[PDB]
Amino acid sequence: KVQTDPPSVPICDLYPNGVFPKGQECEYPPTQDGRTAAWRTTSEEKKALDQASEEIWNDFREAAEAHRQVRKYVMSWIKPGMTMIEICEKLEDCSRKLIKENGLNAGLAFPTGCSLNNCAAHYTPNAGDTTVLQYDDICKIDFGTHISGRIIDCAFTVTFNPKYDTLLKAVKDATNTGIKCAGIDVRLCDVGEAIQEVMESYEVEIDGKTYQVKPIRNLNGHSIGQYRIHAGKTVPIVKGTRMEEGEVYAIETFGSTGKGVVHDDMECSHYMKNFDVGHVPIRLPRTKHLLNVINENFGTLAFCRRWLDRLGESKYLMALKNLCDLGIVDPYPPLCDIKGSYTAQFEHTILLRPTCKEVVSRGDDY
Ligand SMILES: Cc1nc2[nH]cnc2cc1-n1c2ccc(F)cc2c2n[nH]cc21
Numbered sequence: 539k540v541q542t543d544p545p546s547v548p549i550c551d552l553y554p555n556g557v558f559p560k561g562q563e564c565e566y567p568p569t570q571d572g573r574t575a576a577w578r579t580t581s582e583e584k585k586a587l588d589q590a591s592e593e594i595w596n597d598f599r600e601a602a603e604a605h606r607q608v609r610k611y612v613m614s615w616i617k618p619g620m621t622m623i624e625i626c627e628k629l630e631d632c633s634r635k636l637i638k639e640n641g642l643n644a645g646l647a648f649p650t651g652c653s654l655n656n657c658a659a660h661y662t663p664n665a666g667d668t669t670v671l672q673y674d675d676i677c678k679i680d681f682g683t684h685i686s687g688r689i690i691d692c693a694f695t696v697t698f699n700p701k702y703d704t705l706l707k708a709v710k711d712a713t714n715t716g717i718k719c720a721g722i723d724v725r726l727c728d729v730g731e732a733i734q735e736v737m738e739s740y741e742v743e744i745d746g747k748t749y750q751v752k753p754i755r756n757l758n759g760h761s762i763g764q765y766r767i768h769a770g771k772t773v774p775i776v777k778g779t780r781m782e783e784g785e786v787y788a789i790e791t792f793g794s795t796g797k798g799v800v801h802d803d804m805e806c807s808h809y810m811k812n813f814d815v816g817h818v819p820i821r822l823p824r825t826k827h828l829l830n831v832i833n834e835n836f837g838t839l840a841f842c843r844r845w846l847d848r849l850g851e852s853k854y855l856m857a858l859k860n861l862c863d864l865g866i867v868d869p870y871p872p873l874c875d876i877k878g879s880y881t882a883q884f885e886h887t888i889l890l891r892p893t894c895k896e897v898v899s900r901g902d903d904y
Pocket residue numbers: 648649691760767768788808809810840841870
């Protein structure tokens with residue numbers, strides 16, 4: 539079984555023995571002592587702990603291989619002139635197929651971000667959005683896959699005009715620096731200070747204006763948990779708690795030519811249940827129904843309005859507002875820097891395995 543062009547074969551079927559490709563494996567950085575962390579690689583007890591979780595790492599790897607194959611496909615066809623809806627639907631159709639979508643056991647971890655220009659995060663079109671991708675746009679493609687709630691959160695930036703090349707390089711460098719600095723017992727604020735230093739070492743010129751690239755100070759990387767995109771630890775991307783063995787992190791950075799701060803803007807598309815809210819009885823019929831739909835289809839994973847539409851739901855906006863007002867669901871609106879600014883993002887998921895650091899979502903692309 540080989541992969542088709544366009545891709546349509548589940549990653550499952552490409553690896554029938556259920557053993558999926560590893561990502562980039564790295565020795566942990568030297569300790570603050572100045573001494574090596576390489577002992578973890580060859581420690582018999584760390585090897586045992588690591589193997590005890592091989593099923594889990596393998597689930598992440600299946601999800602990451604789906605992510606790699608989806609994004610290579612996206613990069614081959616994404617072009618100005620396509621609607622944002624067309625882009626997201628074409629991406630998601632591929633993602634569903636390769637992940638072998640199966641209820642809450644395998645599927646899409648969160649909606650496809652395609653945030654444009656000064657918008658950095660959490661834009662995906664709602665129904666009727668006529669927005670078309672433009673030649674001068676800078677588009678952040680941020681999408682997620684999961685197997686058994688083991689989530690790959692991984693993102694890149696798309697451009698067509700070379701004027702943004704150095705901005706993209708700054709952010710890629712910053713993200714890779716954060717990944718490099720990450721490790722067991724490493725302080726989160728230190729990972730963030732390293733990212734800032736690299737990002738701000740770049741100056742760029744766009745349409746005759748110069749800028750020192752700024753990290754977006756109120757966006758940040760995060761720990762990841764089972765069915766939990768943000769498990770409660772945050773990684774700053776400006777100057778300001780430790781990472782721990784067995785944790786999983788999304789290392790993302792955002793660079794901006796604007797103020798380096800984002801605000802909520804535009805219509806909301808992204809929503810997610812509050813992870814910590816349990817059973818809440820609801821009699822209101824449309825609200826009750828929508829919560830049941832959400833519980834069945836998404837659980838604690840994020841969703842968007844288009845995904846409710848595709849399930850055949852309609853007249854749900856008041857019901858959704860009700861769930862938000864009750865605190866059962868939280869809205870995650872688009873996050874934008876100032877009008878006229880440009881933002882870029884790169885993001886990987888990393889596994890802090892007992893023996894090594896695995897950049898599980900690394901590809902030959904980024
Ligand atoms: C930014 C954020 N902040 C949070 N505070 C508590 N839980 C949180 C979850 C998120 N978060 C999300 C929410 C909704 C979605 F659709 C995609 C994400 C997402 N990607 N990386 C982090 C993400």
